[PDB]
Write a protein that binds this ligand. Structure first.
Ligand SMILES: CCNC(=O)NCc1ccccc1-c1cc(-c2cnc(NC(C)C)s2)nc(NCCN(C)C)n1
Length: 339
């Protein structure tokens, strides 16, 4: 059991083991606040997230469990993974705080694309790594659902990691038309739509579909990709969605070469494959990695899949204390990475 030191950072109290030195606020995280810290044990610069009211309700307790399970499962270079997880609590009875530890990253893609237009080689490498990371996440039957520039973290040497995958349930600019409108069934390719939007923005320096509401968002989308075809209309079970689509002004699919003028034709070809309205026709992460645009990076022997992931808990209806105890077992059973 380590020695814990107490401090206050922006009205919140942090009780962390002594190895975590020079805690400095970095901003808001998914369901809590994040601090940059120096880990004396590894010499790594780390990001520490203290979850906010982790067991206040069934909803909080289940998502705390969900995030910890996800983080403990992910072991890939382009996917955020767990370096450590701790609680100052000595017993389950006392258990009320969860601190999660991962690598501290240099910047987010949101702040990089404002400093400013990336070269085609830089786009190739960053998009490659997103798709490599999504290939792995998707292989464990996990979907991001809210992939966007603010959850893509990158270092000075251009190494990228995906954060906040598997947490979103139920940013609009990067959202697939089907997951926003609940038309079609939807699959893991909802993240590929997001990749397309991010890639377009990295290449042009401009948001591809900067909508104001769900209706304006669809309008902007259909202006590029065209109104749904007869083959796609056949696949819509929602009578509301169908009536609406058929009511809208018919729009043809624009030629992406005439939109993304100046861009590498291989980037334009990939975008055409990622920005397909029909979720069944959209390119997958594994297929996109073999696209000629990634010729200098693609390595089919270094594009791993994940071990299977047990998501059965998602279907369970348990009490706060049950979710809390399950989280406590996951905290105690944690094994840090090897050297
Ligand atoms: C399972 C998915 N969970 C997950 O990825 N958790 C992330 C996570 C897990 C355990 C410990 C820390 C984090 C965690 C780490 C970090 C950062 C690491 N390096 C950063 N550098 C700055 C300069 C860009 S931010 N940011 C966020 N939230 C950044 C803002 N988001 C988009 C709200 N959460």
């Amino acid at each position: 059991r380590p020695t814990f030191y107490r401090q206050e950072l922006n009205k919140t109290i942090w009780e962390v083991p002594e190895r975590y030195q020079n805690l400095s606020p970095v901003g808001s995280g998914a369901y809590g606040s994040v601090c940059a810290a120096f880990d004396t044990k590894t010499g790594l610069r780390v990001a520490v997230k203290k979850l906010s009211r982790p067991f206040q309700s069934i909803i909080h307790a289940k998502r705390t469990y969900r995030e910890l399970r996800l983080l403990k499962h992910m072991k890939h270079e382009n996917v955020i993974g767990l370096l450590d997880v701790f609680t100052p609590a000595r017993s389950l009875e006392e258990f009320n705080d969860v601190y999660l530890v991962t690598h501290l990253m240099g910047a987010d893609l949101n702040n990089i694309v404002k400093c400013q237009k990336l070269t085609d080689d830089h786009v190739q490498f960053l998009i490659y790594q997103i798709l490599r990371g999504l290939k792995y996440i998707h292989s464990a039957d996990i979907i991001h659902r809210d992939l966007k520039p603010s959850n893509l973290a990158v270092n000075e040497d251009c190494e990228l990691k995906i954060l906040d995958f598997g947490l979103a349930r139920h940013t609009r600019w990067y959202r697939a038309p089907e997951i926003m409108l609940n038309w079609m069934h939807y699959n893991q390719t909802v993240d590929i739509w997001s990749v397309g939007c991010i890639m377009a923005e990295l290449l042009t320096g401009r948001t591809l579909f900067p909508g104001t509401d769900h209706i304006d968002q669809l309008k902007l989308i259909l202006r590029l990709v065209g109104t749904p075809g007869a083959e796609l209309l056949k696949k819509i079970s929602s009578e509301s969605a169908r009536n609406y689509i058929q009511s809208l002004t018919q729009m043809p699919k624009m030629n992406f070469a005439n939109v993304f003028i100046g861009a590498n034709p291989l980037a334009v070809d990939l975008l055409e494959k990622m920005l397909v309205l029909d979720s069944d026709k959209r390119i997958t992460a594994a297929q996109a990695l073999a696209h000629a645009y990634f010729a200098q990076y693609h390595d089919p022997d270094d594009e791993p899949v994940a071990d299977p992931y047990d998501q059965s808990f998602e279907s369970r209806d348990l009490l706060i204390d049950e979710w809390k105890s399950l989280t406590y077992d996951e905290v105690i059973s944690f094994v840090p990475p090897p050297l």
